[PDB]
């Protein structure tokens, strides 16, 4: 064949920390379908947003948003344990069906995204070139996010622990833990990996009695 009808750009969703995770690669022949299992970002998270994206960038914000929906009713569990299956199905008319199903709760939500959605031919060419020019930056970005995500998790787990420790945590430790939580929050906004790990450390050094109480 000299002609193949294909999806011109990668299709996927946003995942924790502002990353695009692809479900269907660019230039895949239609019709096509793929499924992947995702989970929650935080302990006891009761809902997830499925933000559907088209593009080749690793930073979700630089790809084209196609649509979004929420899936609620996720029962309490530690982060990463719920099994949310996301399926992308592009039919022969180019219509994109996206569904998300929570295997434990049985709850499911879906959207339909029409064939004309997304980037036009000119923006497609530009997207491919843009991802090529940013390949190395996007590699550094993915590394930065894995550290940001650890920092986010430590911040949340420490906060929960402070709450349930309540009264049995000395006011000296609480004000030190408080300051270090704020400092970690500040670091988490920037793109310096060492900065973030450094504030995680400073938090761990004031958390010893908390860790004892929590355990």
């Amino acid at each position: 064949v000299l002609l193949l009808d294909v999806t011109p750009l990668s299709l996927g969703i946003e995942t924790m920390g502002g990353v695009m995770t692809t479900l269907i690669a660019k230039n895949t022949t239609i019709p096509t379908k793929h499924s992947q299992v995702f989970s929650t970002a935080e302990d006891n998270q009761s809902a997830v947003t499925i933000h559907v994206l088209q593009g080749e960038r690793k930073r979700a914000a630089d790809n084209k948003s196609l649509g979004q929906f929420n899936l609620d009713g996720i029962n309490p569990a530690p982060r990463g344990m719920p099994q949310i299956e996301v399926t992308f199905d592009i039919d022969a008319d180019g219509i994109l069906h996206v569904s998300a199903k929570d295997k434990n709760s049985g709850k499911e939500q879906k959207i339909t995204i029409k064939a004309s959605s997304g980037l036009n031919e000119d923006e497609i060419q530009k997207m491919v070139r843009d991802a090529e020019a940013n390949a190395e930056a996007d590699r550094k970005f993915e590394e930065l996010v894995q550290t940001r995500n650890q920092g986010d998790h430590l911040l949340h787990s420490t906060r929960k622990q402070v709450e349930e420790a309540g009264d049995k945590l000395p006011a000296d430790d609480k004000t030190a833990i408080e300051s270090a939580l704020t400092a970690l929050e500040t670091a988490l906004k920037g793109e310096d990996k060492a900065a973030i790990e450094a504030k995680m450390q400073e938090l761990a050094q004031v958390s010893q009695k908390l860790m004892e109480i929590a355990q």
């Binding site: 946003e14 995942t15 990353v19 009761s46």
Partner: peptide, 9 residues
């Protein structure tokens, strides 16, 4: 991987 929660109010 992991999914965000819906944007809070």
């Amino acid at each position: 991987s992991y999914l965000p929660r819906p944007t809070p109010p």
